[PDB]
Design a protein around this ligand. Structure first.
Ligand SMILES: O=C(c1c(F)cccc1F)N1CCCCCC1
Ligand SMILES: [Cl-]
Ligand SMILES: [Zn+2]
Ligand SMILES: [Zn+2]
Length: 574
């Protein structure tokens, strides 16, 4: 406890000795409170380029409301000795499997610096006002070694979280986390090839094909249960099992990673703004509070573990979570060695998001381990059996569903989809300040090229994407201040479409290139409507007919630049 968090608490208390006070009206019941001190200190801005080219959606509240505008302070009971054993055995088998074809290794100042000099979201907090300033100041790199040497010495002074669910930290604490645990993401530990259940690096154009491949397996319904507040249900045992990745390390690396887990993850210090505006200094040992990138890989690991145990429960590998007989301990082991790899292949897991095709439907009511691990399902009663999906094209995953779409030439595309109001509403929103008109235009172009590559099958989005690309100067480079983003390019979008959907698509045997957009199909007209199309409305007809007037409005605002007309790529403007 304070033998681990005190130096951080002491350092903060002194920097605010003038305002230090043990407030008696602290609202915390699960988070340990330490003290308070004095301070005084983020809306979604509209993208004008996208909004002027999507006029019909100006009167659709599901779009327009997206731009406008309790669980962390809860506890998670300790699992039962049978649960804690199932988790330990499974977590041991899983780190060994993930480690068979990979080597844990430290990530480098050079690698960190290259990532900061390319605008990667490292959940950092404002000596220097930009990350680039710190990584360009041998004084910034002088602070790390002190704490780095403190970590090698098993102590921590400056690794404190700022709650804003994103727990930000000083760039130096982020570096130390990246050096020790960045290898999980940088070396693709959760790739489907290495993890079997994972989809890290896959891309939205691959996820539907992956779910269709899971659907091919013999077995029961496809289950896609969401957890209620996954990051808040992470137990101190879960952290212990995640920490076992250090059993595969050596030297400096082993000690640097052991310190991240012990000092930052299993014993956190957090700063939180309370309007009553003060700063509260609180501590808790459980729950997830690491960096987003590390959070993703450890959530994927612990979710893979939890779903294999739910599969074992459905198959009768054990009978009760109270106590695991030494015999069962050997049955659980022999199950993992004999069929563990096959079982991981029956799943698609992206952090807290899973799809599972179990051996049969006993899985639906196999709930004792899942509830006792604290991974309580959302929107269902605790012993109410799960609702499965009978058709892979109906399963939700990574905020999408997937359509099977047949090209006029017979070839099969499996495409990503979601309600079109969500897509249009998100493209109309920008985050941050000081956006020039050029920077706003280039963010609109990023959305447009994403729509051309992923959502070409939606009539409204192919038309709006063509309009935005016509309205923004042809050589201006797509930008985003904040999968695999193949749309982030100035290459011709037909050439990129061919590369992604034909040349590099391992599910497409015939590699004949597509010569024009007119060849590339849409959903059926009624399916497009079901998924939120405005086709058939008078507002949409007037927009499509008059689109050149909308394009010319935006071109007149941007000014006298070089533009290309992409509308004749469509059938109706040709
Ligand atoms: O009015 C329609 C229409 C229709 F006639 C039948 C079914 C669904 C529809 F949306 N369409 C005009 C808008 C552009 C492309 C879709 C066709
Ligand atoms: Cl279904
Ligand atoms: Zn530290
Ligand atoms: Zn759809």
């Amino acid at each position: 406890n304070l033998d681990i968090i005190g130096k951080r608490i002491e350092k903060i208390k002194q920097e605010h000795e003038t305002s230090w006070h043990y407030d008696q009206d602290h609202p915390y019941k699960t988070w340990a409170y330490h003290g308070s001190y004095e301070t005084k200190q983020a809306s979604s801005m509209v993208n004008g380029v996208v909004r002027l080219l999507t006029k019909p959606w100006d009167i659709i509240p599901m779009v327009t409301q997206m731009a406008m505008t309790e669980k962390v302070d809860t506890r998670t009971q300790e699992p039962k000795e049978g649960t804690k054993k199932l988790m330990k055995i499974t977590a041991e088998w899983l780190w060994k499997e993930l480690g068979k074809k990979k080597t844990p290794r430290m990530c480098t100042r050079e690698e960190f610096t290259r990532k900061v000099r390319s605008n990667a979201a490292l959940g950092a907090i404002f000596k220097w006002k930009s990350a680039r300033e710190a990584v360009e100041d041998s004084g910034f790199w002088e602070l790390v070694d002190k704490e780095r040497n403190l970590h090698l010495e098993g102590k921590c002074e400056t690794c404190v979280y700022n709650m804003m669910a994103i727990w930000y930290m000083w760039l130096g604490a982020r570096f130390l986390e990246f050096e020790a645990l960045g290898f999980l993401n940088e070396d693709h530990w959760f790739s489907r090839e290495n993890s079997l259940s994972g989809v890290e690096g896959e891309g939205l154009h691959k996820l539907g094909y992956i779910l269709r491949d899971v659907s091919k397996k013999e077995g029961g319904a496809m289950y896609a249960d969401d957890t209620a507040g996954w990051d808040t249900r992470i137990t101190l045992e879960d952290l212990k099992n995640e920490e076992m990745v250090t059993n595969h390390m050596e030297g400096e690396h082993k000690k640097l990673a052991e310190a991240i887990f012990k000092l930052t993850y299993q014993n956190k210090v957090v700063r939180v703004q309370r309007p009553t505006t003060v700063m509260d200094i609180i501590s808790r040992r459980d729950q997830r509070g690491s960096g987003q990138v590390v959070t993703y890989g450890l959530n994927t690991f612990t979710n893979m573990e939890a779903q294999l145990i739910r599969q074992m429960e459905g198959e009768g590998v054990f009978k009760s979570i109270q106590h695991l007989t030494v015999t069962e301990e050997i049955a659980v082991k022999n199950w993992l060695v004999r069929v563990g790899r096959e079982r991981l292949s029956r799943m698609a897991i992206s952090g807290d998001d899973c799809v599972v095709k179990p051996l049969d439907d006993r899985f639906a009511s196999a709930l004792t381990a899942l509830n006792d691990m604290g991974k309580v399902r959302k929107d269902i009663q605790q012993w109410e059996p799960s609702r499965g999906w009978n058709d892979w094209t109906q399963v939700p995953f990574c905020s999408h569903h997937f359509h099977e779409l047949i090209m006029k030439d017979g070839r099969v595309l499996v495409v990503p989809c979601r309600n079109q109001d969500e897509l249009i509403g998100r493209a109309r929103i920008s985050q941050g300040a000081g956006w020039s008109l050029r920077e706003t235009a280039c963010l609109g172009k990023s959305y447009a090229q994403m729509w051309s590559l992923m959502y070409f099958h939606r009539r409204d989005l192919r038309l709006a994407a063509n309009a935005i690309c016509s309205a923004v100067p042809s050589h201006w480079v797509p930008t985003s201040r904040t999968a695999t983003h193949e749309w982030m390019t100035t290459e011709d979008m037909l050439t990129v479409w061919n590369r992604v959907w034909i040349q590099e698509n391992p599910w497409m045997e015939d590699k004949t290139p597509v010569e024009s957009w007119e060849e590339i199909p849409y959903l059926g007209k009624r399916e497009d409507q079901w998924c939120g199309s405005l086709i058939g409305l008078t507002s949409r007809a007037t927009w499509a007919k008059n689109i050149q007037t909308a394009i010319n409005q935006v071109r007149s605002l941007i000014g006298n630049e070089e533009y290309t007309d992409y509308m004749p790529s469509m059938k109706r403007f040709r």
